[PDB]
Amino acid sequence: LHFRLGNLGEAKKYFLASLDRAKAEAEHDEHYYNAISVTTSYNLARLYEAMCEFHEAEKLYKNILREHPNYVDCYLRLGAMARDKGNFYEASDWFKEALQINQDHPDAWSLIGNLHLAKQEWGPGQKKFERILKQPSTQSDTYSMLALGNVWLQTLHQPTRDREKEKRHQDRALAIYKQVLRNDAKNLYAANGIGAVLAHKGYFREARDVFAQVREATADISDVWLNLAHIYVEQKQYISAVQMYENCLRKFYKHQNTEVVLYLARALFKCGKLQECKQTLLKARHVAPSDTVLMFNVALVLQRLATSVLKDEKSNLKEVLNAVKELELAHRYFSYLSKVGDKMRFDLALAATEARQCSDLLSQAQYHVARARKQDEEERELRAKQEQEKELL
Amino acid sequence: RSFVDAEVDVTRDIVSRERVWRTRTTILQSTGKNFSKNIFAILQSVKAREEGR
């Protein structure tokens, strides 16, 4: 219960005290207190996972498997820890053993499914969810129905130039979300799924209202915040979107999530926070420099800031010198991306198109270095006049 | 495994005494708000558009 309350210290103390006392009470019914010790060991292992004492988490799961090896939850947590290590291979190895122990276990299929979905293996991922609904023990699993809906929706995020493939998937996803919401009126994901397909269908007006109505029940679904923030960007209420992305980053991510940071950068660009847009993308490049889409966005912000500095002759020398080198760096980055860019993440014509605009503005930028020097001298005359006039008094 | 399979009943014993309220089905359910009536009212509007009315 303390774990459920987030009282990791108390949970640790109480589970440890429970195990130490359990050795004393096991004297009455060793089998029963051994079962209790399994529950206490699992609860403590799950806490150590949350507390990052992974050697003790690993050892406790292994202890349960040493004493009670059919406890599927140990295999799944060992795999989930591998997933947290980012080791989809090791994670799948542990989840596969869980399926080899109980082929109809829905979380084992789902965990491997998460590995397939993260890897864009929509077909193989789909296999995991389809296998669950046909079995009587899981024939009513809304999670799997919604998972098929999510598979179709995830395919909707990838660009197929023939809209019918996407639209065929749209109707597949929507039929699932419509029925699931009919069967379970508290279903958060069916409602959001309807909103998601309406949004893909372009019905942002209703989709926003739906995402808002889903948000009224819970503050812990980031996608609802993200969908609302995206529509706020599309509806040009950029301040609200920026505020959602900033607080979303502070609440849900223990690190700067580049997806949210990019959504924030897109809003900040339009929000006029060009300084923060620049800083946010520089932070993003500092976090994921091999991601060429973020690198492009950095070059784009440098280009857009320089465009403003270069248009108005009131801009000073430090601003112009920064704009020249920053714009040279941006052109250099687009030129670099044209040679080292990751072709699978962005449209190749985009980098070549922006590179030209940067080179053009850099050519015009050299004049401003000479222009800026006079503006500094212009005030000195008034100051000299002020000095002699002060001597007059 | 002939020696391990004999304890699946023990794992069932543990699981029979163990209780968790948040599951893959209940994790998908709201704390108290029912969405059906509003979203179906929205679908009343959307269904007409999907049928081209």
Partner: peptide, 27 residues
Amino acid sequence: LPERSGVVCRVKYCNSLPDIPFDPKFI
């Protein structure tokens, strides 16, 4: 005229599955 270039971000309307609830077990 070339349609105004926005920040390069692939639009995703998501409905992400929640993490599987492996919460500590009551006895």
